[PDB]
């Protein structure tokens, strides 16, 4: 009937071995009209009794206390964790099979939902994935590796871009809008990560972690039901004799069972005191409201009585096992009868059974590399910087010109990385700011000479245009690479987990757009190298030609910190350029220095350089070659300040189209930029 705050609480609290925090759970029961619990499941194979009967016990308690309970069928998560031979279609059969077992397990089907992760994520792709990247952005790679146990894996060592999966599970907490995470203790590390993320985004209400007991494995050298033995677990439609065989050979020491120390990772450690027969009694028999067990006429009302009787040898090992076999066979009976008397359900079960000889000890399937594009197509990522140096920008421009010249049939796309640059924490880590700076840098690059034929795309167009296929590409690429391999890209200097996803996204983008070549600056050649690596030398790496406009200080006398005035940027206005060229280093009778270097570059670009000299200083002259120019600077013939005014003149000229945009179209964005520059006080 009707229940109150205190009896609702006692009931919900009894679900979990641990509850972070008890005060929050109480405040939830008092305040919230409908409480949403959730648990998620990798569809990897026949269902273990823990995910069926034991789960059903705890869900019934949750629904009794006035909760909705969501089953998150984690199809993409099983793909990322290399289940069912990594075949997504087979994983979805297993998922359908799981939903049939849960429907026969006697749960309140008015307050239980069965959601598919892929279906739900793709329906809200913009919301979900932004948060996944935001979680990765704000966390270290070390912190995410520590979540390895939620996948039954070991940190470092083997992780294979199984960094994304924990980031996703965490996103989910918020996505489902769950109030209570009601998963097993081995998930505790990612649940804590979700509570950590509330503090990062300033959300005051945190999800309550109501973690449940991890049910023990049947065989002797293991404290959890595993992938090594089919005999470590009872499956949910095991025949009555298979149930008997498994329980009969089970480890069964005559020792009283005490509660385990809650380890920080949550995964149970193997111990000889842990008796899995008694653990089944405690979790699947005595956890149901009115449950009781009986051996030879005696009826034991609580678990303590049955345990006490077994320790003092009033009940024998074979008697206790025969009691459990009966208790389990009664509980699995409804499930067997459903699969015995339904064509659809029976077919699913047969398909799942066929994957025990159909998907394992056969090399796991992985996404195939697409073939090469027929027409050559180059790709170049815009730097997400407030301050793009002129030398870098010039090299981008020249690389696109050089490509078009070499392949007149072909294409060049500049990608604006408005998703992946947020993920890697490029500026302030804020979407608004990163879009602004990319739009600004795009405009100024065109103003400095980027060909009109160059196509411009955002990640946003690419991703939202292919909501499913893009992220499946990313999952495919991620599965095929060790985390250590992506760590090597940054020489072990990865500052956040978002940088790992950024690398995967770039490759996915290069594949989506059918690119034959990737063009790299000095700032991203480490990332684009991965695209070549992944495609097995199919995609070619073109390097930009930098080093032609140097820093303006004296070589061999650099300041410890480079100031703004020591380097030419492409957002420099008239005042900036005058100021930098004024302070720039040059000296008489010297063949080389930064000013001569900038002049030699301008001479190459414009054909010649005209020094305007009032007579008495030598009058006017043109230099049409660099060798003539350095000779006159070395002889003393050309005074430093004469050259300086000539260089200054040409830099203002080349920058005229750009400086017009700085005062007009881009003035809205540039104001929003220089606030984000100051916001980098740190």
């Amino acid at each position: 009937g009707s229940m109150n705050t205190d009896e609702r609480y006692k009931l919900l609290r009894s679900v979990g071995e641990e509850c972070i925090q008890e005060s929050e759970l109480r405040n939830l029961i008092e305040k919230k009209p409908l409480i949403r619990c959730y648990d998620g499941f990798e569809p990897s194979g026949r269902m273990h009794i823990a995910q069926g009967i034991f789960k059903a016990v705890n869900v019934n308690k949750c629904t009794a206390a006035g909760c909705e309970f969501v089953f998150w069928v984690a199809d993409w998560f099983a793909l990322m964790n290399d289940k069912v031979g990594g075949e997504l279609e087979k994983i979805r059969i297993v998922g359908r099979y799981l939903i049939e077992v849960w429907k026969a397990a006697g749960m309140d089907t008015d307050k239980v939902l069965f959601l598919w992760s892929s279906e739900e994520i793709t329906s809200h792709a913009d919301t979900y994935w932004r948060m996944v990247l935001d979680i990765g952005r704000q966390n270290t790679i070390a912190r995410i590796k520590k979540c390895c146990t939620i996948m039954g894996k070991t940190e470092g060592t083997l992780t294979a871009a199984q960094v994304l999966y924990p980031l996703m599970q965490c996103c989910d907490i918020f996505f489902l809008k769950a109030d209570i995470c009601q998963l097993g203790l081995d998930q505790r590390k990612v649940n804590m990560l979700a509570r950590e993320y509330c503090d990062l985004i300033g959300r005051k209400l945190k999800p309550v972690i109501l973690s449940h007991h991890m049910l023990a494995g049947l065989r002797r050298g293991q404290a959890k039901m595993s992938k090594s033995d089919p005999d470590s677990a009872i499956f949910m439609e095991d025949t009555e004799e298979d149930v008997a065989r498994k329980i009969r050979q089970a480890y069964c020491p005559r020792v009283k069972q005490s509660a385990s120390a809650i380890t920080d990772d949550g995964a149970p450690v193997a111990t000889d005191d842990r008796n899995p027969v008694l653990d089944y009694f405690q979790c699947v028999v005595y956890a149901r409201p009115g449950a009781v067990a009986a051996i030879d006429g005696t009826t034991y009302a609580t678990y303590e009585d049955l345990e006490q009787a077994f320790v003092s040898d009033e009940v024998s090992e074979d008697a206790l096992k025969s009691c459990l076999i009966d208790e389990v066979n009664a509980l699995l009976a409804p499930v067997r009868q459903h699969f015995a008397s339904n064509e659809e359900a029976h077919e699913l079960l047969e398909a799942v059974k066929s994957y025990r000889k159909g998907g394992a000890t056969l090399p796991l399937a992985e996404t195939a590399l697409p073939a090469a594009p027929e027409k050559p197509h180059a790709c170049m990522w815009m730097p997400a910087l407030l301050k793009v140096p002129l030398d870098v920008a010039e090299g981008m421009i020249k690389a696109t010109e050089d490509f078009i010249a070499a392949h007149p049939g072909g294409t060049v796309t500049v990608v604006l990385p408005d998703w992946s640059a947020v993920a890697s924490d490029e500026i302030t880590g804020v979407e608004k700011d990163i879009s602004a700076a990319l739009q600004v840098n795009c405009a100024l690059l065109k103003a400095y000479g980027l060909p009109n034929s160059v196509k411009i795309v955002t990640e946003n167009e690419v991703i939202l245009g292919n909501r499913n296929d893009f992220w499946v590409s990313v999952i495919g690429i991620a599965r095929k690479n060790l985390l250590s391999h992506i760590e090597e890209l940054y020489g072990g200097e990865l500052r956040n987990a978002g940088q790992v996803i950024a690398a995967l996204m770039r490759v996915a983008t290069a594949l989506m757009l059918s690119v034959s070549h990737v063009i790299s600056t000095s700032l991203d050649g480490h990332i684009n190298a991965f695209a070549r690596e992944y495609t097995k030398e199919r995609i070619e790496c073109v390097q930009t030609l930098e080093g032609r406009i140097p820093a303006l200080h004296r070589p061999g006398a650099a300041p410890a910190v480079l100031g703004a005035d020591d380097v030419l940027y492409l957002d420099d206005n008239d005042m900036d350029i005058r100021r930098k060229i004024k302070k720039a280093y040059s000296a008489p009778n010297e063949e080389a220095n930064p000013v001569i270097s900038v002049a030699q570059h301008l001479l190459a670009q414009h054909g010649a350089l005209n020094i305007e000299r009032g007579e008495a200083n030598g009058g006017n002259v043109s230099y049409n070659t660099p060798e003539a120019l350095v000779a006159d600077c070395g002889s003393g013939a050309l005074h430093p300040a004469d050259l300086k005014a000539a260089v200054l003149q040409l830099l203002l000229d080349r920058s005229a189209q750009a400086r017009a945009l700085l005062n007009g179209e881009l003035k809205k964005n540039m104001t929003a930029l220089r606030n984000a520059e100051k916001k980098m006080a740190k």
Partner: nanobody, 118 residues
């Protein structure tokens, strides 16, 4: 092949200073990242600073930030490390290395010894 030769090392007192230089050949220095790395006695190689082609992007190991300065002359194919306010912890063989990209280097010169002791 790639050749790199360092010079400028020696013995100084704490609070002293030096300027290392590296002369290079056999590759396109002017379009390459370049590194300074060091090896203290019974320790691994560790990078000290690095600089991109245009001399506009520079990084420094925390312990030398504000005291050391890296620069390059692309015309002369030489790299420079100005070391000021030297400390005993800076004692090491300093090497000049070719950068493949921002986070990696390969070829190294023979090295120049730097010692800071009273």
């Amino acid at each position: 092949q790639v050749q790199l030769q360092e010079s400028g090392g020696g013995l100084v007192l704490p609070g002293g200073s030096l300027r290392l230089s590296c002369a290079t050949s056999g590759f396109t220095f002017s379009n390459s990242w370049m590194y300074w790395v060091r090896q203290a006695p019974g320790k691994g190689l560790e990078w000290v600073s690095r600089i991109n082609a245009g001399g506009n992007t520079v990084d420094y190991k925390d312990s030398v930030k504000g005291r050391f300065s890296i620069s390059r002359d692309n015309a002369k194919n030489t790299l420079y490390l100005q070391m000021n306010s030297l400390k005993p912890e800076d004692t090491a063989v300093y090497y000049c290395a070719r950068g493949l990209n921002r986070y990696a280097y390969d070829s190294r010169g023979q090295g120049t010894q730097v010692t800071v002791s009273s």
